[model samples]
Target chain A: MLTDIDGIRVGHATDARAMTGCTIAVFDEPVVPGVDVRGANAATIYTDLLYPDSVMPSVTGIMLTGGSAFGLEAALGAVRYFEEQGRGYDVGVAKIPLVPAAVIYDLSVGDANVRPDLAMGRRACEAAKPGPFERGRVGGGTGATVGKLYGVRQSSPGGLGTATVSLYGGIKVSAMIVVNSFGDLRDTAGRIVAGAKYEGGEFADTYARMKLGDKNQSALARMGTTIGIVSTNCRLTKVEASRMATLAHNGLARAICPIHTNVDGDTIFATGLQKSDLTAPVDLLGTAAAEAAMLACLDAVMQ
Target chain B: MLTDIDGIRVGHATDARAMTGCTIAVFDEPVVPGVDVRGANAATIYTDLLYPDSVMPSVTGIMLTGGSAFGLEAALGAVRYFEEQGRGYDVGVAKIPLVPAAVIYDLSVGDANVRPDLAMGRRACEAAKPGPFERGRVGGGTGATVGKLYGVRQSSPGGLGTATVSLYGGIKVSAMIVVNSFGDLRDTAGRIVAGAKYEGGEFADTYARMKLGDKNQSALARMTTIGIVSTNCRLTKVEASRMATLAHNGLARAICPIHTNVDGDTIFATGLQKSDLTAPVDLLGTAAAEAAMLACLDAVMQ
Candidate 1:
């Protein structure tokens, strides 16, 4: 079993003005094996890089950003920054940074006036750091909001949230999510944790209330999406990451009442931090991914 | 190939308070097989009359009501009305009406004051009829709206829409859908069809505007679920129903951006009314069901 592995850093550049920006999760050391799962419409870049059968070992970094397709500029900036730091596979005299990146759609939700352009990308690269990450209304999730029927003015604040669980035999799994789904946020007990509180500032069962004759036709027309990453120190292959990404859907299923809609482009990125000989069970990992996803979502909503 | 084998009447009892109401599709004659595919978080009633494996030979009626789960009472009233009409399977001299019904979560976007109670159900049962059903904002789709982002005051209008397509030689496949989903209504061209309008009354690409950092978070939160029914002279058994239901996801995929969320409860109903000895290919039927669903969604938005 591969225990703790160091040399990884996480940094975020939040563009709250337009609800978009870039977030970079950098592994200074080699991430020999990495995986990704994509559930999206329109176009998602860098999805082809994580093929277990294709990608070689020794990845330098992974970037998660926002601004729709234009936000991809951030990844380029990240590449430039890492290359300058000499963090890539050694080739002749210069080292190359083998970074895989993903971007989510946020151009239309937060400010919609500005996109995460090249400048924002560069800023995010400069802001990339190693520890004590911030949460709630920061980074890619700075403009994130839940329960949007009332608009941003009425939505609950949302942002990056991370959680970790150590299973038996010292298996540690960590999940970091940028929640931007199309429903109210709720906890495990099914109580509304964020967004659109009903009368008297009480958390109303929005679903149950909709069951009543609220008949407000306006609450059923918005498109929603979310994206996140799940990482573990255990050694695994790209195929395992794909399966782990699929398991992450169970987390979305648990938290968002109606998820995976035609409008949602929910994606999950899985990374193996260490190289080990232990076989990681696909089913168990899937369950853990789902649980972690839900926990990540809940954590963001509550505190 | 069982072309209109029996009489199934569809009626609309609309309450246009917020542009929504109750529309019931009643089968006066026996419907050979009925199947269900449920993909909603808070779906109240989808009774399992036929076992998961067993095939239901026929059903007396189907009620498509508004007021979310409370609208289910309309289905119960439909059962009573069918029983009183002596139009059900005979267990002895008494008639037992096996009415399979489903409802969509429309109340959240409808009138918040009036619940779809048993009285509304009874009224709908009384208004059940067969020919030339009303469309648009009446029946179970009266208060229906699509592309809602901010609230009812700033949303687009959507209601009950139906379409029919020819498939497999001479067989006809038809689909009826109540357009209610938590996303912008899009045409086949990926353009927003029913939400916010731009200046000069032009159709606004609500999604595109959001992409430009317009910051319309309200457009991303809401409870939107669709209720779809696909009918053909062919197809039977629970598997057929399941396939048809799965096919409905295609419709959601085509028009709405996301589907099957915890807040949205989408239902797909299959009515196999065929009487031919030969059954249609299950996969083909599923494909047609999916196609019909997508077509219905597009037609309504268009």
Candidate 2:
């Protein structure tokens, strides 16, 4: 659904041997941005400029990468892509493309020594294109895992999930999520959809174990992250866009039990193209953003 | 209810002239601590020490104060009180009392220049007691206000509110809250108990107004919901930390439009480890969240 926006393009670079990858989204034109960081230990670059009070008018691109904090450098690769195409905000001396980026901790399950670098980031940018893109076992979620109540052994596979909500009159809101989490993903029926499991093949039920004082739970620290972007084809100010990001967190909370813990670095970024002739209310867009995020999370596991 | 645990004391010092003050909770002994900071612009001290990964064992006291960042100095007064009574973790050279503190932005309503000082912190420590304590329009909440969709004029008075839940076999969970928020307070029945109001006396309904793009809502920033949750139930540091994070749901349930870019909401959880009773983290956290919600609602009531 992200590509549903007229000029937005999605791209990915996957290192199957290393079990790591990166995702890049380049916009034809800069868009107003807002962000909400719920997790305690997030790793990112240029996110502060997304704040409502920031003087920066817009951002040219977003970079999501794997390899934990080390993956942050991959953004430079994406930056070089922008530089080549002459796409950036002009500051008189030079045209600098502003690319806000975030990363996930995928080293535990993958080859820890290997990480996404500047070269891999460039590959993703070169692959950028409009229309449908790949999902699951690709992009930043290549090595993503979820439901780590007892570490990686009991966890389930997680990956990049994408969703779009098209409202009446052509208004659209969409999400792209990389779901690596310390908690379990639950469905609307309250069933454990994707999560930790016991040796007997039953869902380990993260909440139930926490209630019973699961002894192995102590090992679950500083291990997971879920990062995503929510974009809309509606007009919005940075503050209203920020509110939409905040509201989208409610979806993360609903889809994942025990979210935003000390270990999980959950963050959501919101962007608006503001080119749609049919404008939607910020609250309505926010609601759709949450719904898109929730659906996208569920989709992450299916693939 | 916080005092129900043996050796736990609560105290407060108010500056009626300045409409700001501080609250102090002094423990006779160090207690296991955990914290969850949900707000974006929190003003705090020694909170990192409470994380489960930190090697620090316990905290001796907690301080909640008004006057934004400046009120943080009141914690020094609390440290002084602990020093005088010899209640501190003994190091090779000196006795250091570890007090984790947080502050709220009450300067909007109170005299911004008259913040809670070291002297007032000392006074609150001097006033510490084990029995029932005062609430509302006092302590860290003296100048606290809520429902600021249009800033202070449309907001209602907010202050210190406390509550306790006593379960079977002597397990007790209690909360003390200082509610200064950028959102409205909603009751269990979904009614707007306290919030921004219109000139004709109807609820301004922040959520609805935001959806409609209320132009007057620009100044709603720098608010907080800082509070403490204490339990007599036995818990490990990890469990206490989880409980503290869980207790934040109470604030979420009671306050609408919370945990935003401007509000610095935080909750601290402590285990006294005095009683022989042991309870599941879920049980303690469930009660603690409810108690916190009731306390938050109580802060704005007549």
Best by TM-score: 2
Candidate 2: clashing pairs of residues = none
Error of 1 at A84 (Å): 2.7
Candidate that scores best on DockQ: 2
In candidate 1, position B5 carries an lDDT of 23
lDDT for each of the candidates? 0.56, 0.79
Off by more than 4 A, model 2? A215-224, B1-302
TM-score of each: 0.46, 0.52
Query: Model 1, range B1-302, lDDT digits (tens) per residue?
Result: 11122355666676766444666666654444434434433332323333233324235655556654335445545555666677654423244454444455454454543545445655776776655555566676676665544444465776676655556555555555666654566656765666655546665555566677654433223214455444555455564556555655556655554443322334545555445533445654565456545644543543
lDDT per residue as tens, model 2, A126-206: 999999999998988899988887877778899999999999988899999999988899998878888888876689889
Cα-based RMSD of the predictions, in order? 21.0, 13.9
